[PDB]
Amino acid sequence: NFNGLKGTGVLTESNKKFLPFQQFGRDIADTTDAVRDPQTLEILDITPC
Amino acid sequence: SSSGWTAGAAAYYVGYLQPRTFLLKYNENGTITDAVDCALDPLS
Ligand SMILES: *[C@@H]1O[C@H](CO)[C@@H](O[C@@H]2O[C@H](CO)[C@@H](O)[C@H](O)[C@H]2NC(C)=O)[C@H](O)[C@H]1NC(C)=O
């Protein structure tokens, strides 16, 4: 429930760099892939298992 | 002083914005590298 992003998946570790204002990653299908954890700042790739 | 002032060179340029459709080509990172306008050319 990361801030209003309901869904089911596996929160792995990724290696992409975010700009200071960009928060939500996306793709062609407009489904969120990369979300930055609200309390600690890092990258968590979202993949359905 | 006021009657004749010597200062360094400077320049400021002003343009004007008009509504258009753009294409943006994102890099492997989040930086925007190229942009293409549509109302410029037949090839565009
Ligand atoms: C995208 O970002 C990556 C790193 O986040 C850049 O990769 C590094 O770029 C510097 C500067 O050119 C090099 O000194 C490093 O050797 C690069 N690292 C690797 C592992 O290759 C990359 O240049 C950026 N741009 C693109 C188009 O990928």
Swiss-Prot record, chain A:
Binds to host ACE2. RBD also interacts with the N-linked glycan on 'Asn-90' of ACE2. Cleavage of S generates a polybasic C-terminal sequence on S1 that binds to host Neuropilin-1 (NRP1) and Neuropilin-2 (NRP2) receptors. Interacts with host integrin alpha-5/beta-1 (ITGA5:ITGB1) and with ACE2 in complex with integrin alpha-5/beta-1 (ITGA5:ITGB1). May interact via cytoplasmic c-terminus with M protein. May interact (via N-terminus) with host bilirubin and biliverdin, thereby preventing antibody binding to the SARS-CoV-2 spike NTD via an allosteric mechanism. Attaches the virion to the cell membrane by interacting with host receptor, initiating the infection. The major receptor is host ACE2. When S2/S2' has been cleaved, binding to the receptor triggers direct fusion at the cell membrane. When S2/S2' has not been cleaved, binding to the receptor results in internalization of the virus by endocytosis using host TFRC and GRM2 and leading to fusion of the virion membrane with the host endosomal membrane. Alternatively, may use NRP1/NRP2 and integrin as entry receptors. This is Spike protein S1. The chain holds residues 542 to 590 of 1273 of the full protein.
Curated annotation (Swiss-Prot), chain B:
It comes from the Viruses. Glycans are attached at N29. Changing G4S: In strain: Omicron/BA.2.75. Residues 27-44 are annotated as: Putative superantigen. Attaches the virion to the cell membrane by interacting with host receptor, initiating the infection. The major receptor is host ACE2. When S2/S2' has been cleaved, binding to the receptor triggers direct fusion at the cell membrane. When S2/S2' has not been cleaved, binding to the receptor results in internalization of the virus by endocytosis using host TFRC and GRM2 and leading to fusion of the virion membrane with the host endosomal membrane. Alternatively, may use NRP1/NRP2 and integrin as entry receptors. Binds to host ACE2. RBD also interacts with the N-linked glycan on 'Asn-90' of ACE2. Cleavage of S generates a polybasic C-terminal sequence on S1 that binds to host Neuropilin-1 (NRP1) and Neuropilin-2 (NRP2) receptors. Interacts with host integrin alpha-5/beta-1 (ITGA5:ITGB1) and with ACE2 in complex with integrin alpha-5/beta-1 (ITGA5:ITGB1). May interact via cytoplasmic c-terminus with M protein. May interact (via N-terminus) with host bilirubin and biliverdin, thereby preventing antibody binding to the SARS-CoV-2 spike NTD via an allosteric mechanism. This is Spike protein S1. The chain holds residues 254 to 297 of 1273 of the full protein.
